[PDB]
Design an enzyme around this catalytic site. Structure first.
Site, PDB file in Angstrom:
ATOM      1  N   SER A   1      -5.875  -3.173   1.006  1.00  0.00           N
ATOM      2  CA  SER A   1      -6.066  -2.531  -0.233  1.00  0.00           C
ATOM      3  C   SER A   1      -6.365  -3.464  -0.633  1.00  0.00           C
ATOM      4  CB  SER A   1      -5.730  -2.087  -0.999  1.00  0.00           C
ATOM      5  OG  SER A   1      -5.294  -0.425  -0.118  1.00  0.00           O
TER       6      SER A   1
ATOM      7  N   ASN B   1     -10.034  -0.619  10.510  1.00  0.00           N
ATOM      8  CA  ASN B   1      -9.008   0.042  10.202  1.00  0.00           C
ATOM      9  C   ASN B   1      -9.060   1.143  10.925  1.00  0.00           C
ATOM     10  OD1 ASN B   1      -8.472  -1.715   7.296  1.00  0.00           O
ATOM     11  ND2 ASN B   1     -11.063  -0.543   7.093  1.00  0.00           N
TER      12      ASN B   1
ATOM     13  N   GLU C   1     -14.349  -5.805   9.267  1.00  0.00           N
ATOM     14  CA  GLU C   1     -12.484  -4.941  10.002  1.00  0.00           C
ATOM     15  C   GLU C   1     -12.968  -3.961  10.160  1.00  0.00           C
ATOM     16  OE1 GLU C   1      -9.480  -4.545   7.867  1.00  0.00           O
ATOM     17  OE2 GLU C   1     -10.149  -3.981   5.524  1.00  0.00           O
TER      18      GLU C   1
ATOM     19  N   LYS D   1      -6.723 -10.960  10.870  1.00  0.00           N
ATOM     20  CA  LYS D   1      -8.041 -10.662   9.554  1.00  0.00           C
ATOM     21  C   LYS D   1      -8.705 -11.723  10.243  1.00  0.00           C
ATOM     22  CE  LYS D   1      -8.491  -8.665   5.152  1.00  0.00           C
ATOM     23  NZ  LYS D   1      -8.849  -7.506   5.858  1.00  0.00           N
TER      24      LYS D   1
ATOM     25  N   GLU E   1       1.141  -1.504  -0.370  1.00  0.00           N
ATOM     26  CA  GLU E   1       0.004  -0.062   0.074  1.00  0.00           C
ATOM     27  C   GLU E   1       0.421   1.291  -0.196  1.00  0.00           C
ATOM     28  OE1 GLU E   1      -2.727  -1.721   3.185  1.00  0.00           O
ATOM     29  OE2 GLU E   1      -4.425  -0.692   2.087  1.00  0.00           O
TER      30      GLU E   1
ATOM     31  N   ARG F   1     -12.400   2.983  10.863  1.00  0.00           N
ATOM     32  CA  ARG F   1     -12.942   2.859   9.919  1.00  0.00           C
ATOM     33  C   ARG F   1     -13.620   1.047  10.409  1.00  0.00           C
ATOM     34  NH1 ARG F   1     -10.770   2.564   4.996  1.00  0.00           N
ATOM     35  NH2 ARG F   1     -11.909   0.356   4.724  1.00  0.00           N
TER      36      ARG F   1
ATOM     37  N   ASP G   1     -15.821  -1.639   9.178  1.00  0.00           N
ATOM     38  CA  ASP G   1     -16.031  -2.208   7.507  1.00  0.00           C
ATOM     39  C   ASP G   1     -17.206  -3.401   7.807  1.00  0.00           C
ATOM     40  OD1 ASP G   1     -15.140  -0.028   5.822  1.00  0.00           O
ATOM     41  OD2 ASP G   1     -13.495  -1.462   6.042  1.00  0.00           O
TER      42      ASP G   1
ATOM     43  N   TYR H   1      -9.398   2.322  -5.811  1.00  0.00           N
ATOM     44  CA  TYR H   1      -8.257   4.174  -6.213  1.00  0.00           C
ATOM     45  C   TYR H   1      -8.463   4.503  -7.366  1.00  0.00           C
ATOM     46  CZ  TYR H   1      -6.959   1.853  -2.114  1.00  0.00           C
ATOM     47  OH  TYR H   1      -6.886   1.751  -0.264  1.00  0.00           O
TER      48      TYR H   1
ATOM     49  N   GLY I   1      -7.591   5.298   4.423  1.00  0.00           N
ATOM     50  CA  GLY I   1      -7.114   6.262   3.214  1.00  0.00           C
ATOM     51  C   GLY I   1      -7.579   7.465   3.858  1.00  0.00           C
TER      52      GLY I   1
HETATM   53  N1  LIG Z   1     -16.380 -13.377   3.110  1.00  0.00           N
HETATM   54  C1  LIG Z   1     -16.702 -12.011   2.347  1.00  0.00           C
HETATM   55  N2  LIG Z   1     -17.941 -11.973   1.839  1.00  0.00           N
HETATM   56  C2  LIG Z   1     -18.206 -11.438   0.300  1.00  0.00           C
HETATM   57  N3  LIG Z   1     -17.641 -10.433  -0.267  1.00  0.00           N
HETATM   58  C3  LIG Z   1     -15.771 -10.452   0.745  1.00  0.00           C
HETATM   59  C4  LIG Z   1     -15.701 -11.185   2.246  1.00  0.00           C
HETATM   60  N4  LIG Z   1     -14.347 -11.034   2.342  1.00  0.00           N
HETATM   61  C5  LIG Z   1     -13.906  -9.530   1.815  1.00  0.00           C
HETATM   62  N5  LIG Z   1     -14.761  -9.733   0.417  1.00  0.00           N
HETATM   63  C6  LIG Z   1     -14.120  -8.357  -0.716  1.00  0.00           C
HETATM   64  O1  LIG Z   1     -12.651  -8.691  -1.024  1.00  0.00           O
HETATM   65  C7  LIG Z   1     -12.753  -7.212  -0.320  1.00  0.00           C
HETATM   66  C8  LIG Z   1     -11.600  -6.624   0.798  1.00  0.00           C
HETATM   67  O2  LIG Z   1     -11.853  -8.107   2.009  1.00  0.00           O
HETATM   68  P1  LIG Z   1     -11.229  -7.207   2.979  1.00  0.00           P
HETATM   69  O3  LIG Z   1     -11.163  -8.409   3.883  1.00  0.00           O
HETATM   70  O4  LIG Z   1     -12.088  -5.717   3.159  1.00  0.00           O
HETATM   71  O5  LIG Z   1      -9.475  -7.009   2.597  1.00  0.00           O
HETATM   72  P2  LIG Z   1      -8.911  -5.266   3.007  1.00  0.00           P
HETATM   73  O6  LIG Z   1      -8.179  -5.496   4.296  1.00  0.00           O
HETATM   74  O7  LIG Z   1      -7.609  -5.376   1.659  1.00  0.00           O
HETATM   75  O8  LIG Z   1      -9.897  -3.935   2.260  1.00  0.00           O
HETATM   76  C9  LIG Z   1     -13.567  -6.533   0.737  1.00  0.00           C
HETATM   77  O9  LIG Z   1     -14.642  -5.471   0.304  1.00  0.00           O
HETATM   78  C10 LIG Z   1     -15.616  -7.003  -0.222  1.00  0.00           C
HETATM   79  O10 LIG Z   1     -15.607  -6.534  -1.901  1.00  0.00           O
HETATM   80 MG   LIG Z   2      -7.940  -3.242   5.678  1.00  0.00          MG
HETATM   81 MG   LIG Z   3     -11.829  -3.623   3.207  1.00  0.00          MG
END
Ligand SMILES: Nc1ncnc2c1ncn2[C@@H]1O[C@H](COP(=O)(O)OP(=O)(O)O)[C@@H](O)[C@H]1O
Ligand SMILES: [Mg+2]
Ligand SMILES: [Mg+2]
Ligand SMILES: Nc1ncnc2c1ncn2[C@@H]1O[C@H](COP(=O)(O)OP(=O)(O)O)[C@@H](O)[C@H]1O
Ligand SMILES: [Mg+2]
Ligand SMILES: [Mg+2]
Lengths: 319, 312
Positions: free
Chosen positions: A159, A284, A282, A116, A13, A268, A270, A229, A288
């Site tokens: 990201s 954060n 998660e 995670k 990142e 943040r 989510d 992005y 960003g």
């Molecule tokens: N269990 C899940 N079910 C559906 N979509 C998922 C799931 N996990 C991740 N995603 C998709 O992948 C994206 C990024 O996953 P994420 O855990 O938030 O990684 P990061 O920390 O890089 O943002 C999410 O915003 C979503 O669109």
């Molecule tokens: Mg994250």
């Molecule tokens: Mg995320």
């Protein structure tokens, strides 16, 4: 008053971090200096830091860690590093040893929110709903407790780097290999679909205040790096079109998680909304921070202007 | 191959840290240099570090952090610091940023095992028994769902500082005030009594191997009694095995690397995991070393393995 802003980093990142720095450097209401960590881990100070920022990416740095920075000149350090070696408690640990106040979550909360697997364990213990998952170690035969589709990810990432959707078990091996390029531990989560993605900002030390809830919409299979992005590719709906109860539950769960994890400064949070069910995806700790990023926009919609948001972040670091 | 041993620290266990360093230097099978963190936080290097070691206590250091240490001269760093600024992930973070391989748990595992509240939340979710507890935040009156006696503790101060045994709810407020002068978060644990304390060692990265189980016992006071590290602990067959299995599960779940001395409470036939010490006492007579020696792993061999694990 003088703030030291650190951006860049060795994580994937790196470029996103420099983008965040551009936004923060433009509206932070305090005399602030910028220090950049190049992709090779060496630091760039003074004018070279600014030159790197303008380049949008700094492959090589000048000073091996730790840098010859006059730390005494700064009242607060604002670590604007996203991902490993910045948002995971490592830089925070260095700052604790230096005895320097800093923005955001401490060592424990930073390390936990980035993982995670562990973050889900703590949240579940507290009764917060999370997505079914399992952690897999590099070199360990995977045994997923549920059938696909799955989302495979490095346990520590950001990201959407190293993340992929897996429809069949026979595709799991390759998905894990990709994840292992970024972390020794990966997580395999049950893929929720269709799903709505909600995000809410929190501000404060341990006991926070929540911003309005926002929603992310896009056409790609999932919220990937290019969708995140590429300006305008994703649609940010603020406030999110949610009924009162769901909106409040999202905000309440965010504050609860924030408190249990002991987050300081900001985060943040989510969530996923699927079939009327909410899941905290998660937290954060160093979201960003471009003026257009979700976290800043969220609070802007909540009556907290960008400059004011940054001011509060700095003040919280000192209390 | 050259190892850098860091000992001392600003915590109350500064002296025992130096004693652990003394034992390690005496048997570590690799060229090794010592660096000492004085009680005032400043570092002592080279000959001054050895002088501090022989003095068994270094009140004042020379170099303010970060020290002008030639890190490139070392392949592995062994942080032999106990408690705050030792087992909490801070020094580990510094070493991670320096890009130096090092002995023991990483940042996340160190910070988590240090926190008596968060470590319990993780373990409880994983199905590992821990004593009933409540997390209390400074300024927020607690609501304890179980009755006294309690053991109130700062969540992350370590070094037994600020820990009180409370027998009355009316004494809780004071006990908490004491704990809060050391941390913004405290825990109120259900006090087990009577209770026996068991300890077991784990070695390895994430997937560890357990040593035999030992018991910490105290003898009758005379004109308090001494403490014996009884190896092996006098337990029923299944109990020792359960202790080892729970330790290994907790170890894996928390992602611990290198080693850990896992401490348990045994009360009314029930086991409770109290703590995973990521940087346990390391003198030739300390529990962790003696446990593995009983397990067929000589002190020098134990040190070699810890150094080699740090590289993998
Ligand atoms: N269990 C899940 N079910 C559906 N979509 C998922 C799931 N996990 C991740 N995603 C998709 O992948 C994206 C990024 O996953 P994420 O855990 O938030 O990684 P990061 O920390 O890089 O943002 C999410 O915003 C979503 O669109
Ligand atoms: Mg994250
Ligand atoms: Mg995320
Ligand atoms: N819940 C409890 N029940 C009974 N005794 C306890 C409990 N918690 C702590 N103790 C006693 O206090 C000692 C130290 O507890 P601990 O939390 O490990 O402090 P430290 O962080 O200094 O190692 C234990 O060895 C035990 O004798
Ligand atoms: Mg401890
Ligand atoms: Mg203990």
């Amino acid at each position: 008053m003088r703030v030291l802003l650190i951006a860049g980093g060795v994580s994937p990142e790196h470029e996103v971090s420099l983008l965040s720095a551009e936004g923060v450097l433009r509206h932070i209401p305090f005399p602030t200096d910028l220090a950049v960590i190049a992709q090779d881990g060496r630091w760039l100070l003074g004018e070279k830091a600014l030159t790197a920022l303008e380049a949008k990416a700094a492959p090589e740095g000048e000073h091996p860690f730790p840098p010859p920075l006059s730390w005494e000149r700064y009242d607060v350090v604002f670590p604007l590093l996203h991902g490993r070696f910045g948002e995971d408690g490592t830089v925070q640990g260095f700052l604790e040893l230096l005895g320097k106040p800093y923005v955001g979550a401490g060592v424990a909360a930073s390390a936990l929110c980035m993982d995670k697997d562990l973050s889900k364990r703590v949240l579940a213990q507290a009764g917060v709903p999370v997505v079914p998952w399992v952690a897999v170690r590099k070199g360990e035969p995977p045994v997923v407790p549920f059938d696909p589709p799955f989302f495979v990810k490095p346990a520590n990432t950001g990201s959407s780097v190293g993340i992929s959707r897996v429809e069949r078990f026979q595709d799991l091996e390759a998905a894990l290999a990709l994840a292992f390029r970024y972390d020794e531990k990966a997580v395999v989560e049950k893929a929720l679909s269709p799903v709505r993605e909600l995000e809410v900002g929190v501000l404060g030390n341990v006991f926070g205040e929540a911003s309005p809830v926002g929603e992310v919409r896009y056409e790609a299979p999932f919220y990937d790096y290019e969708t995140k992005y590429t300006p305008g590719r994703a649609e940010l709906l603020i406030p999110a079109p949610l009924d009162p109860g769901t909106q409040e539950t999202v905000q309440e769960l965010a504050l609860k998680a924030y408190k249990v994890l002991g987050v300081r400064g900001m985060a943040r949070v989510d969530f996923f909304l699927a079939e009327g069910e909410l899941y905290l995806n998660e937290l954060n700790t160093i979201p960003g921070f471009t003026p257009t990023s979700m976290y800043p926009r969220l609070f802007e919609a909540g009556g907290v202007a960008y400059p004011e948001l940054l001011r509060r972040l700095v003040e919280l670091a000192l209390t």
